[PDB]
Design a binder for this molecule. Sequence first.
Ligand SMILES: CC(C)CN(C[C@@H](O)[C@H](Cc1cc(F)cc(F)c1)NC(=O)O[C@@H]1C[C@@H]2CO[C@@H]3OCC[C@H]1[C@H]23)S(=O)(=O)c1ccc2nc(NC3CC3)sc2c1
Ligand SMILES: [Cl-]
Ligand SMILES: [Cl-]
Ligand SMILES: [Cl-]
Ligand code: NA
Lengths: 99, 99
Amino acid sequence: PQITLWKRPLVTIKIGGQLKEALLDTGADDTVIEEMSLPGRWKPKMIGGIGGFIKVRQYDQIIIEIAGHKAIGTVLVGPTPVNIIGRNLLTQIGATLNF
Amino acid sequence: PQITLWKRPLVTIKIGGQLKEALLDTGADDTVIEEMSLPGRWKPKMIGGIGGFIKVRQYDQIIIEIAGHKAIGTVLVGPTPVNIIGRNLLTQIGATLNF
Ligand SMILES: CC(C)CN(C[C@@H](O)[C@H](Cc1cc(F)cc(F)c1)NC(=O)O[C@@H]1C[C@@H]2CO[C@@H]3OCC[C@H]1[C@H]23)S(=O)(=O)c1ccc2nc(NC3CC3)sc2c1
Ligand SMILES: [Cl-]
Ligand SMILES: [Cl-]
Ligand SMILES: [Cl-]
Ligand code: NA
């Protein structure tokens, strides 16, 4: 598909058996999801943008389905205001910016 | 161009006759640039990021070139940790996400 940018590029994702809405975010290195349980091990991490830093849990090798497309990668879980699909997963679904 | 996402989508912008580096950011509604001088009056705005809010200065109808593409629109100036080109200007340069 081709997604215009007149409004926020929100898509449905499936993660951890749950459906969520998330933002396709080319300005995000990493994928950051609101609080949820995920299986396996994790380790703490600090990530920082506008307004400062938040503490998250880093889970590796997590399968996600993004707008119908499966990928695997690291997911960060914590108190983000918005669920964000970052470049680590956008690359895996073949997403590009075109102009 | 067609920009892949294996690295940050950084481009050169020109604003006020000066070149700067900025991030093409589909997760940003608005364009936010580090402290600089812009002409005219400004209005107040708050923008919510992952770590909290910053106050910024809103300047309207600013001439800005993004990767060689001319735009004229709203620029927010404040203590952002990187220069961000958001959807208000990505739409002016005809950018889409594709996969
Ligand atoms: C968090 C998103 C929902 C929103 N952000 C855009 C992001 O793309 C942002 C853009 C960004 C902001 C920043 F401060 C530094 C940076 F490197 C990139 N990424 C970011 O915060 O990522 C974090 C900082 C690292 C970079 O990527 C890594 O993985 C993602 C999690 C973190 C780390 S933002 O920068 O806070 C932003 C930009 C414009 C904007 N415009 C707004 N307008 C108001 C009407 C609503 S709110 C608003 C918020
Ligand atoms: Cl990853
Ligand atoms: Cl590729
Ligand atoms: Cl604008
Ligand atoms: Na894991």
